[PDB]
Amino acid sequence: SEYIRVTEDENDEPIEIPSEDDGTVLLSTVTAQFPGACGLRYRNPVSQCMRGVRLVEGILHAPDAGWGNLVYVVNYPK
Numbered sequence: 001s002e003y004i005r006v007t008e009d010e011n012d013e014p015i016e017i018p019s020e021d022d023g024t025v026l027l028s029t030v031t032a033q034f035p036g037a038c039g040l041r042y043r044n045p046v047s048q049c050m051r052g053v054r055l056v057e058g059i060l061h062a063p064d065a066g067w068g069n070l071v072y073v074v075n076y077p078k
Helices: 027-033
Strands: 002-008 015-018 039-042 050-052 053-056 058-060 072-075
Touching: 015 027, 027 058
Parallel strands: 002 072
Antiparallel strands: 002 015, 039 050, 039 072, 053 058
């Protein structure tokens, strides 16, 4: 039952987004909860700077360090 936590505000309580069997997350799993979302970002706990999730053909790839216990934030266009 592996998942990642996604919110549109670190203020708000996040939603649990299930991962696939290969450990990736489908953009479609995110957009079902956050229609219009064009990607994920998180605070790098080392740099304390915001950091992007790799996205290739509707597939979100875990950071090299793994998904971990991080809260991910959705990006929308304007």
